[PDB]
Design a protein around this nucleic acid. Structure first.
Ligand SMILES: Nc1ncnc2c1ncn2[C@@H]1O[C@H](COP(=O)(O)OP(=O)(O)OP(=O)(O)O)[C@@H](O)[C@H]1O
Ligand SMILES: Nc1ncnc2c1ncn2[C@@H]1O[C@H](COP(=O)(O)OP(=O)(O)OP(=O)(O)O)[C@@H](O)[C@H]1O
Ligand SMILES: [Mg+2]
Ligand SMILES: [Mg+2]
Lengths: 465, 214, 71, 109
DNA sequence: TTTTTTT
C-alpha cells in the first residue's frame, strides 16, 4: 500500500488547497497569508519548502533535497486538471498580511482572508494603530485637501465629483468611464497622484500615452500587460493638439478600454487576455480632441477642474492678476519629502474608506460630464436644439411646405438656403463656421437640381403653428 | 550650457566624468525629439538610476527640415518615474535621479510655449575664448567673447589620466556643503531665452477683466 | 439590421449572445475597410469556429472622408 | 539528527544577510564592500566561493566542487521569499570600497 | 510611408 513516497507527499500538499490553476493557465500559491503568482519564479518549490513543517516528521528530510522538490513539483503540476475563478469580490481590499472588508471595516487574516482569491495586494502590511480618525497627520492632510479643493457653494459639485473619482479606485469592479484632471501649472495634480499612489501601494500603475494613440493588437505590448488586474491607471503630459504634428486620440481605443476584458500580450508569454479593474486618470493642461464624435463616445468622458495656485512669494502679485486661478497660497517646499516618506499613507486610506462609505455602498456607477469638452459642446448643442424628421410629421406637412419642407419623394426637403439662414440666426457663424460647413456637407442631400435639402426640422418648426 | 566655440564646456564635461566615474552617462538627441514609449529604447533604459546625463551638440533649428524640441518630452523628463522599455525586456519603470545637461551652440527652439514649460528651464553662459596665437587678434573683434586666453595643448591628456579627479571631487563636495545642506532645489531662469521674455512682457502689460473695472 | 434607435436591437443582440454562449463574437468595422493581408490579424483567427460575428455602430457614410466598405 | 549538509551551509550563508531580492526581480550580493547585481552572471556562486573562508573548515571542501555550489544556490533561491527596497538615501556617495557621507565627509567601510 | 524586435 506504501507506494511512491514522493507521490504521497505531493498528494498531501495538494489536499491543503494551496496551489491553484487559473483559467488562463497561471499557478497561484498561498505564501505568507497572500496569494501570489509569478511566471519567472519557482513559486511551487518555495511553497513546498515553506510548508515542509506541516507534514509528518518522516517527509522533511526528503523535502530538503532540491531534486526531490523538483519531482514533487512535477507531480503536483501533473495532478491538477481544473481551473478556478479569482477576484470575484469587488468590495475587498487585499494587503500584504490580510484582507480588509470595506462593508463592515473588519480586517481578516489567515484562513479567513484565504477564502477570497485575491491575486494582487497593496504590497505593504496593514497597521491598525495608524488606521485611526484622530491624528495630527490626519489634520494636516485635511488642511492640504481643503487648500487644493476648497469647499464652497461654487466648488461643492466639483469636490463631490473629485471625492467620488478618488474613492472609486478602491473597488475591484469595472469602471465605465475615465477621468481627466484639467488645470494650470502648480495646481496640485501631481501631489494628488503621489498621495494616491502612496495610499494604494502596488495597486497603482502608470503607463505611456501609446494606449490612446496606437493600435493594441499588433505585436507584444507590455504596457497593456502591466495594466492587468490593476486598480488605478495613470497617464500624464498630453501634448497640445493646436500645433501641427500632434496625433488625435482615437475613439476606438477609448471604446476598447471600457470593456471587462482587454487584449494584449507580454514578451515570451502567450497570455493575451487581461481583466480591466482599473480607473483611468489622464492629467493634462490641454483639453483633448478626438477624430470622431458620437453619443457613445461622449457617454464615457468626465472632467475634474483644479483651480488653486501655489506660487512663490515673489510671484503672488503676478499670479493674482491671472484669471485662471481662484486662490493663490504659499508654496510648501517640504511637502514632497514628507509625501515620499509615506507620512500620510494611513490617513489617506482612512479618508478614502470614509468617502467609499459615503458614496458607493448602494451601487457603483460613474456618470459622464460631456458639457465641458469644446468639441462635444457644438455637437451636443445640435442634438438638443436641432432634431431630425420622422413619419410623425405628416399632419404638419402643410406648415412644412409653408416654411419650405416639401415632401418630395415621400421625405421632407428644406432648401439649404433657408436652413443655413436658420442656423446662422441661431447657431453663431463666427464661432463654429467650419463645423457648420462640416454639418452641411456631411448629411447633404439634393431633392432636385434646385431643392438641395436636409431632413432636419428645427424645434420651433416641429411645433405645429 | 550655452556658449561659442572653444569656451570650455567639453572640458567641464570631461572633468565631471572623471570625477564621478560611471554615474555619468551621455545620451543622444532622440529623447528630446521622439516618442519614448514606442518600441525598445535603450537610450532611456540606460538612464535608470544614473546621477548625471549629458546630451551634446544641439543642431541649429533655423535650418529647414530640422525638428524642434517637444514640450511633452521635457515635461516627461522631470517626474520621478520615466516610462521606457529596454530591448528584450518588459519593465517600463525607471527611477529618475539624474541631472540633465545639454551642450548647445545655438538657443533652443520649442514648438509650444506655456508656463509649465517655462518653469523647467535654466541656462548658464560661457564667455571666454581659448584661441591660438595666430587667431589672437581676430577674437578681439567678437562681442561673444569677454576674455581671450592661450590654448594649452597638453591639458587634455592630463584629464585623460584622471590627474584632477580627487581635487575636483573635493571641490564638488565643498560646493554641495555650501549650497544643498538645508535643502536641494533648482531655480528656473526664464529671463534669458528671448521668446520667454516676450511672454513675460506681454503678460505683465495686461490685467484680466473683473467687476472692479465696471 | 437597419432601423430606428432603441427598437430592441441591443435586446436581441444580448438575447442571441446569452443563447449561443461563447459562440458569439463582436468585431469592429475596420476589417471591412482595411487590408487583411498586412500585419498580424488575430481578429481573423478570432471568428474561427464561431457561430456569430457582430459588427455594430457602423460609421456614418454621410461623413466626409469615411472609408467605404469595400465590396 | 542534522539533515542535509548543503542545506545547513545554505542556511548559514543566508543568515549573514549577504544576498537580497529586489522588487524588480534581480538578486543583489555583497562582495568586496559593495552591492553588485547582473542578470547574465552567476553572482550567487561567486558569493558562495568567496565567503567560504569564514565558514567552519568542514564546509570549504564541500564548497570547492561546482556542483555543490549549484545545489547551494538552488537552496538559497528557494529560501528567498521577501523583497526589499534599494537606494533610499539621497545623500550618500557609493564607491568601489565604501560609502562617503556627504553631510560629514566621513568614509564608511 | 517597414524596417528590427521577437521566438
Ligand atoms: N496645500 C499646499 N500648500 C502649499 N504647497 C502645496 C500645497 N499642496 C501642494 N503644494 C505644493 O505645490 C507644488 C506644485 O504642485 P504640483 O506639482 O502637484 O502641481 P501641478 O499643477 O500638478 O503641476 P504640473 O502640471 O506643472 O506638473 C508642489 O511642490 C507641492 O509641494
Ligand atoms: N584654462 C585653460 N587654459 C588653457 N587651455 C584651456 C583651458 N580650458 C580649456 N582649454 C583648452 O581650450 C580648448 C577649447 O576647449 P573646448 O574644446 O572644451 O571648448 P568648447 O567651447 O567646450 O568646445 P565645443 O563646444 O566645440 O566642444 C581645448 O583644447 C581645451 O583643452
Ligand atoms: Mg504637477
Ligand atoms: Mg569644447
Amino acid at each position: 500500500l506504501d507506494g511512491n513516497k514522493l507521490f504521497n507527499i505531493a498528494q498531501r500538499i495538494l489536499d491543503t488547497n494551496s496551489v491553484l490553476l487559473t483559467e488562463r493557465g497561471d499557478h497561484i500559491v498561498w505564501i505568507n497569508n497572500s496569494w501570489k503568482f509569478n511566471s519567472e519564479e519557482p513559486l511551487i518549490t518555495k511553497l513546498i519548502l515553506s510548508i515542509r513543517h506541516q507534514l509528518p516528521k518522516e517527509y522533511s528530510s526528503e523535502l530538503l533535497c532540491p531534486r526531490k522538490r523538483k519531482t514533487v513539483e512535477a507531480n503536483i503540476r501533473d495532478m491538477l486538471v481544473d481551473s478556478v475563478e479569482t477576484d470575484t469580490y469587488p468590495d475587498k481590499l487585499p494587503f500584504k498580511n490580510g484582507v480588509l472588508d470595506l462593508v463592515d471595516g473588519m480586517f481578516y487574516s489567515g484562513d479567513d482572508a484565504k477564502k477570497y482569491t485575491c491575486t494582487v495586494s497593496t504590497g505593504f502590511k496593514f497597521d491598525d494603530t495608524k488606521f485611526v480618525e484622530d491624528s495630527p497627520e490626519m489634520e494636516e492632510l485635511m488642511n492640504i485637501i481643503n487648500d487644493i479643493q476648497p469647499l464652497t457653494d461654487e466648488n461643492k459639485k466639483n469636490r463631490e465629483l473629485y471625492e467620488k473619482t478618488l474613492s472609486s479606485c478602491l473597488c475591484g469592479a469595472t469602471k465605465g468611464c475615465l477621468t481627466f484632471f484639467f488645470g494650470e501649472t502648480a495646481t496640485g495634480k501631481s501631489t494628488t497622484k503621489r498621495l494616491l499612489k502612496s495610499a494604494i501601494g502596488d495597486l497603482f500603475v502608470e503607463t505611456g500615452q501609446t494606449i490612446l494613440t496606437d493600435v493594441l493588437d499588433k505585436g507584444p505590448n507590455p504596457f497593456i500587460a502591466n495594466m492587468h488586474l490593476k486598480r488605478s491607471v495613470f497617464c500624464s503630459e498630453l501634448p497640445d493638439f493646436a500645433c501641427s504634428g500632434s496625433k488625435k486620440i482615437r475613439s476606438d481605443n477609448i471604446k476598447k478600454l471600457t470593456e471587462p476584458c482587454v487584449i494584449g500580450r507580454p514578451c515570451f508569454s502567450n497570455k493575451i487576455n487581461n481583466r480591466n479593474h482599473a480607473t483611468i486618470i489622464i492629467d493634462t493642461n490641454y483639453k483633448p480632441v478626438f477624430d470622431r464624435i458620437d453619443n457613445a463616445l461622449m457617454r464615457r468622458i468626465a472632467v475634474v477642474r483644479f483651480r488653486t495656485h501655489f506660487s512663490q512669494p515673489s510671484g503672488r502679485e503676478a499670479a493674482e492678476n491671472n484669471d485662471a486661478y481662484d486662490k493663490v497660497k504659499l508654496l510648501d517646499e517640504g511637502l514632497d519629502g514628507k509625501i515620499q516618506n509615506n507620512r500620510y499613507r494611513f490617513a489617506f486610506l482612512y479618508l478614502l474608506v470614509k468617502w467609499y462609505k459615503k458614496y458607493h455602498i448602494p451601487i457603483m456607477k460613474l456618470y459622464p460630464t460631456p458639457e465641458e469638452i469644446p468639441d462635444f459642446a457644438f455637437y451636443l448643442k445640435i442634438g438638443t436644439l436641432l432634431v431630425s424628421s420622422s413619419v410623425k410629421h405628416i399632419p404638419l406637412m402643410t406648415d412644412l411646405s409653408k416654411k419650405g419642407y416639401i415632401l418630395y419623394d415621400n421625405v421632407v426637403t428644406l432648401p439649404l438656403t433657408t436652413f443655413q439662414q436658420k442656423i446662422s440666426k441661431y447657431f453663431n457663424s463666427r464661432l463654429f463656421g467650419h463645423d457648420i460647413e462640416s454639418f452641411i456637407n456631411r448629411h447633404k442631400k439634393f431633392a432636385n437640381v434646385s431643392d438641395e435639402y436636409l431632413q432636419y426640422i428645427f424645434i420651433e418648426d416641429i411645433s405645429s403653428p
